[PDB]
Paper text:
The RAS family of oncogenic proteins is important as therapy targets because of the frequency of activating mutations in almost all major cancers. All family members function by signal transduction to the nucleus of cells via interaction with effectors (such as RAF, RALGDS, and PI3K) that catalyze phosphorylation of downstream proteins. When KRAS is bound to GDP, the protein is in the inactive state and becomes activated by nucleotide exchange from GDP to GTP. Mutant RAS proteins remain in the active state and hydrolyze GTP at a much slower rate than wild-type (WT) RAS.
As a comparison with the KRAS169Q61H crystals, we also determined crystal structures of WT KRAS188, mutant KRAS188G12V, and KRAS188G12D (all isoform 4B) with a GTP analog (GppNHp), using crystallization conditions similar to those described previously for full-length KRAS188G12D. A further comparison was carried out between the switch regions of the two full-length KRAS structures (G12V and G12D) with our new KRAS169Q61H structure (amino acids 1–169). Both KRAS169Q61H and KRAS188G12V lack stabilization in the switch II region, and this instability could be attributed to the lack of a Mg ion binding to the switch II.
Numbering used by the authors: 0 to 61, 67 to 171
Write the structure that this text describes.
Amino acid sequence: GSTEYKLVVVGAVGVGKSALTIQLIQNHFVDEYDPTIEDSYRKQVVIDGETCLLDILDTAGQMRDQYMRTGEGFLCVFAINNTKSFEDIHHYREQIKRVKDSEDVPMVLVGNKCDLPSRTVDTKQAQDLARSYGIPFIETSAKTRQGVDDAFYTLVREIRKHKEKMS
Ligand SMILES: Nc1nc2c(ncn2[C@@H]2O[C@H](COP(=O)(O)OP(=O)(O)NP(=O)(O)O)[C@@H](O)[C@H]2O)c(=O)[nH]1
Ligand SMILES: [Mg+2]
């Protein structure tokens, strides 16, 4: 078996967690909203010449300790027209560090819905927060597929760097 990576997608209700994950796995988008309880998915990919098995947990917007314990890296999603969702990232991250007992947990900040018109969260404020945390920031649109593969592949790169360092 090729290296397995356990990725967990977290963020507020309605930000696009499910829409990003379904683009990655099935290559389509839907407008209809079906709220998530707890979903999981598996996908084989090649990243930087290496075959990876991605094991993805797609979490509910509104159980937390257990997924924080199992995940190796976290996709922290907000929507660019949802100020509260952006503010919520601080609270997710604190809960993660506390569960892992560690200042260093692989994470990627994702600002989704970049296809929409009136953004209430600006790029600079998100870039600033990612610089503070020492993690990457990626803008995405699950509607168009812009950035989707980059978001997940970057998270795997962050997990690889963390194993190297911990060694
Ligand atoms: N314009 C646009 N709409 C999107 C985008 N991503 C998701 N949406 C829309 O936003 C709504 C919520 O998407 P969804 O994937 O269900 O969000 P979620 O974060 O999984 N919700 P939950 O926490 O309840 O499981 C749907 O109407 C969906 O089509 C996007 O990038 N752009
Ligand atoms: Mg969902």
